[PDB]
RNA sequence: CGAAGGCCGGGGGCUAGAAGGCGAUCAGACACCACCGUAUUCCCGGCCGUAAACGGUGCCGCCCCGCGGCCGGCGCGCGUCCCGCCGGCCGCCCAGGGAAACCGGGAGGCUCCGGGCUCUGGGGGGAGUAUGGCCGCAAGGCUGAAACUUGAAGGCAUUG
RNA sequence: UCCAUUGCGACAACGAGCGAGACCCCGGCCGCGGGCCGCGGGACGGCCCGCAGCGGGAGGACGGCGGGGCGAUAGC
């Protein structure tokens, strides 16, 4: 939600994304988070239009290289793998 | 002289490219085919075109550059007979399907 | 006019883009500095130059000489910018700077000492930076407590929009440049930091994105 | 199973001597000899997951295809020919996703590359304009930087054109150009290097 | 004065002392891990006379018998007879004979 | 307990060789280079207690991306090999650290600072000196100031 | 590799400029014009041999054209 006034008011200037594997904020000036999306077919092995799956994956997991698995684990639990 | 500058040299490319029709291997009618503000700078760049028509010879070496790189024979090239898969791929495709 | 020259600076041109918020939210590179300048028309972003320093380059006839200069950028309510400069002329060399401290502006997050009843005036929680030997950290103050800095850090953190605050420095902080630099660093880590504020969970939606 | 006869006559299934820890899980036995088996089920779940992952992206030509290895080089040129990709054939030039003068600079949005020590600065430059990639894999690869591999045997040209070769076919047939469950037109002797 | 090798100028891995060989060029005292060692075969008449020794020799199936001889020199003689060269920043790294 | 040199009392004495002698070189050469040579170098019984005695890096304990090499012990495997485990010695290296060089089996997990214990430093000189004390046969060692003087000294790194 | 940061080819760099060269002047051989002067041609590492170019031969007035003019940035 973001932090608030003493009335209910979010007074936040913008909420940034967190990573889709580790929780951590993204934050603007990381040019190594790549946001990346997913067909979700449905239909007898043909995608649809404007109905896919999205994830974050920040610099920091990147850089070691810890996305081929986690990104994996990630859609098998969504349902894209087995 | 001996060696040549990267202006006749470039020059010498985009006459040879633009022309290569009409060159021969040899020097006086070359001339023609370069006839530049300056006629000994037309005398180098020619004698450059020369050595570059007899060179390219050992565009028509691109046309059927395409044409060479599309034709699929009529055979398959996989068209095996016998599996050899007798060791570790022999257990992997056990534990995948149907052998 | 001007002439986009990347795909997000021509998609300034239209009523795409509205403001900087999205485009830090998917953190892009701003390469062209009209980008800014739409967003930010006529002199709501203030500028003022930090300091020239003179630069030897020793030589077989003598010593070649010129200018560093490092020029500071602010909106006064959420947006900083440092760069520098180098050039054979003062002039140019505080241009090369100015432009380099429009392309890189960040925001900053702001809070709230003790009681939440206005705006947020302070650092939102403890700040850190580094830079060189120098080391800074910024502390959340009260109300009419103002800016407890060194003139040189007081400046930026007017122009940041940070009303009250503590500051304290470490290592040598006479080296001006490393100075600023640590606490450019320290505001732009202010959007890093996970606070329980944030920590819910949400859906990624690819409609909304700008494609990178 | 077709394919699966294919990828045993090309050998898409042979590792290098060596194996690196995060391609562990995609290994099934080992060869006397030392040498390195993959689960070729797990080789076709990692090339449909990497053609779903490519049909989200409206205009193809947008996708950049990279690949320095000469053995590759044909197997590049058709897998656009088909699909509408962006081949950079040859040496990858410093700048062109960071340097805007350059006269092949480009913007695009998913790289996918063929070999991870190859091709390394179009990998390390990715890096700088937040795009993701996918690359062909051996068992001695190196992930940094990488968002999805797939394992496979990348020196041998028939690994090499059949591996493009599958991946186009799965694209078209997601994006309904060509049909389901049918054999392609294409012969993948076309990807393969003479 | 940085410290200019991970090795420190020697071979030396978990002891305390390693033993003395003498220069052979000008016969100084250097530990024996540190010491700049090659090995050469020759053989003892020059290949331009042993022609005209296999020639003149009475046995039938006589060969001519090599010499096997280990050089060990220090690093001022090494560098100075070019038995070692100094080298660029980069490729004082590389390990290749 | 303690390299080498040194000292006391016995023995031994090939090599080399402080000192000493001598041939050259030179402006001079009492030095480097050539030749001869005493202590010393070796053994036995003591003493002395220092070295760039160095990884210029104190000891115990935890966590720590990876790829190799060698050394000792063990176990599973197929048919010497091969995969692991414990312990040691080494190379390269993501992150992180740092003024950098570089470290990375830590010099990491530290201005987001707190696992336990012992020792040492506080601008450059004067000075490790004077003085007192303990130890030593001596040579020394260990402990160790003050007056006075000075704007720098010094680290790593860049171009010439 | 060349007289030459002249070039070939390779490269976290891609793409330009100056200096170099090109240019100007003189002098060799040949044509049209005028009455020697003044307008053009000619020479290029072109030919044939041996391994971007180093060699050997041939023809030609001249063989790698010859003597000069000009001359970067930075300065004392
Ligand atoms: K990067
Ligand atoms: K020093
Ligand atoms: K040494
Ligand atoms: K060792
Ligand atoms: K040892
Ligand atoms: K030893
Ligand atoms: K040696
Ligand atoms: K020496
Ligand atoms: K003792
Ligand atoms: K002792
Ligand atoms: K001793
Ligand atoms: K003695
Ligand atoms: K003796
Ligand atoms: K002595
Ligand atoms: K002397
Ligand atoms: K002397
Ligand atoms: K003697
Ligand atoms: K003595
Ligand atoms: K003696
Ligand atoms: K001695
Ligand atoms: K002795
Ligand atoms: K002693
Ligand atoms: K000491
Ligand atoms: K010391
Ligand atoms: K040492
Ligand atoms: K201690
Ligand atoms: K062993
Ligand atoms: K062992
Ligand atoms: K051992
Ligand atoms: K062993
Ligand atoms: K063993
Ligand atoms: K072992
Ligand atoms: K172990
Ligand atoms: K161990
Ligand atoms: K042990
Ligand atoms: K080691
Ligand atoms: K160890
Ligand atoms: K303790
Ligand atoms: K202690
Ligand atoms: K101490
Ligand atoms: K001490
Ligand atoms: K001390
Ligand atoms: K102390
Ligand atoms: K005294
Ligand atoms: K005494
Ligand atoms: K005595
Ligand atoms: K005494
Ligand atoms: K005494
Ligand atoms: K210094
Ligand atoms: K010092
Ligand atoms: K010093
Ligand atoms: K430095
Ligand atoms: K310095
Ligand atoms: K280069
Ligand atoms: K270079
Ligand atoms: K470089
Ligand atoms: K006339
Ligand atoms: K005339
Ligand atoms: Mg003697
Ligand atoms: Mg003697
Ligand atoms: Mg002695
Ligand atoms: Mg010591
Ligand atoms: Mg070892
Ligand atoms: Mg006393
Ligand atoms: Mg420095």
């Known amino acids: ?82 | 002289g001996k060696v040549r500058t990267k202006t006749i040299k470039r020059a010498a490319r985009k006459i040879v490219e633009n022309n290569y029709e009409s060159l021969k291997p040899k020097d006086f009618q070359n001339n023609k085919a370069i006839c530049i503000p300056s006629k000994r700078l037309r005398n180098k760049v020619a004698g450059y075109v020369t050595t570059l028509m007899n060179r390219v010879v050992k565009r028509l070496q691109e046309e059927e550059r395409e044409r060479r790189d599309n034709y699929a024979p009529k055979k398959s090239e996989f068209d095996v007979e016998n599996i050899t898969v007798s060791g570790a791929t022999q257990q992997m495709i056990d534990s995948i399907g149907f052998k | 006019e001007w002439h986009p020259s990347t795909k997000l600076g021509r998609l300034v041109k239209a009523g795409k883009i509205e403001s900087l918020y999205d485009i830090f939210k998917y953190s892009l590179p701003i390469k062209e500095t009209e980008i800014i300048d739409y967003f930010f028309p006529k002199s709501e972003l203030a500028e003022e130059v930090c300091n020239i320093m003179s630069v030897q380059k020793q030589t077989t006839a003598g010593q070649r000489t010129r200018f560093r200069a490092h020029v500071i950028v602010g909106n006064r309510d959420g947006f900083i910018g440092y760069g520098a400069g180098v050039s054979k002329e003062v002039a140019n060399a505080i241009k090369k700077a100015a432009k380099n401290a429009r392309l890189n502006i960040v925001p900053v997050r702001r809070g709230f000492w003790g009681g939440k009843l206005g705006d947020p005036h302070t650092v939102s929680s403890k700040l850190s930076g580094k830079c060189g030997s120098v080391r800074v950290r910024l502390i959340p103050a009260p109300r009419g407590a103002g800016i407890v800095a060194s003139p040189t850090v007081a400046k930026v953190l007017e122009f940041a929009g940070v009303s009250d605050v503590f500051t304290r420095q470490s290592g040598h902080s006479r080296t001006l440049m490393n100075s600023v630099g640590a606490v450019y660093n320290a505001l732009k880590s202010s959007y890093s930091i996970l606070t329980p504020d944030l920590w819910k969970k949400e859906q990624l939606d690819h409609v909304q994105d700008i494609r990178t | 199973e077709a394919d699966v006869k294919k990828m045993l006559v090309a050998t898409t299934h042979l590792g290098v001597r060596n194996i690196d820890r995060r391609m562990q899980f995609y290994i099934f036995d080992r060869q006397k000899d030392g040498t390195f088996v993959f689960n070729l089920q797990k080789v076709w779940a990692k090339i449909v997951f990497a053609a779903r992952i490519l049909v989200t992206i409206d205009d193809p030509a947008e996708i950049a295809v990279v690949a320095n290895r000469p053995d590759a080089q044909r197997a590049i040129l058709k897998f656009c020919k088909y699909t509408h990709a962006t081949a950079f054939p040859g040496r990858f030039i410093p700048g062109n996703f960071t340097n805007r003068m350059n006269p092949n600079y480009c913007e695009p949005r998913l790289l996918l590359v063929n070999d991870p020590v190859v091709d390394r600065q179009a990998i390390l430059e990715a890096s700088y304009v937040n795009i993701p990639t996918i690359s062909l894999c051996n068992s001695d690869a190196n992930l940094k930087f990488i968002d999805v591999a797939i394992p496979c045997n990348n020196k041998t040209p028939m690994s090499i054109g059949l591996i493009y070769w599958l991946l186009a076919r799965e694209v078209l047939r997601l994006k309904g150009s060509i049909s389901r469950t049918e054999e392609w037109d294409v012969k993948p002797d076309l990807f393969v290097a003479l | 004065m940085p410290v200019k090798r991970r090795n420190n100028g020697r071979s030396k891995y978990n002891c305390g002392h390693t033993n003395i060989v003498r220069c052979q060029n000008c016969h100084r005292c250097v530990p024996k891990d540190k010491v700049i060692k090659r090995f050469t075969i020759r053989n003892i008449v020059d290949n331009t006379i042993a022609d005209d020794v296999l020639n003149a020799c009475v046995i039938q199936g006589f060969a001519i018998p090599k010499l096997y001889n280990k050089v060990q020199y220090c690093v001022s003689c090494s560098i100075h007879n070019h038995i070692v060269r100094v080298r660029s920043r980069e490729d004082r790294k590389i390990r290749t004979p």
Do not use: W
């Open chain 1, 1 to 82: 939600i973001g932090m608030k006034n003493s009335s209910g008011v979010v007074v936040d200037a913008y909420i940034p994304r967190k990573c889709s594997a580790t929780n951590r904020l993204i934050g603007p000036k990381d040019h190594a988070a790549v946001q990346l999306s997913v067909a979700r077919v449905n239909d007898k092995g043909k995608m649809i239009e404007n109905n896919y799956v999205t994830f974050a994956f920040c610099g920091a997991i990147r850089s070691r290289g810890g996305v081929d698995s986690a990104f994996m684990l990630l859609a098998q639990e969504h349902g894209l793998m087995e």
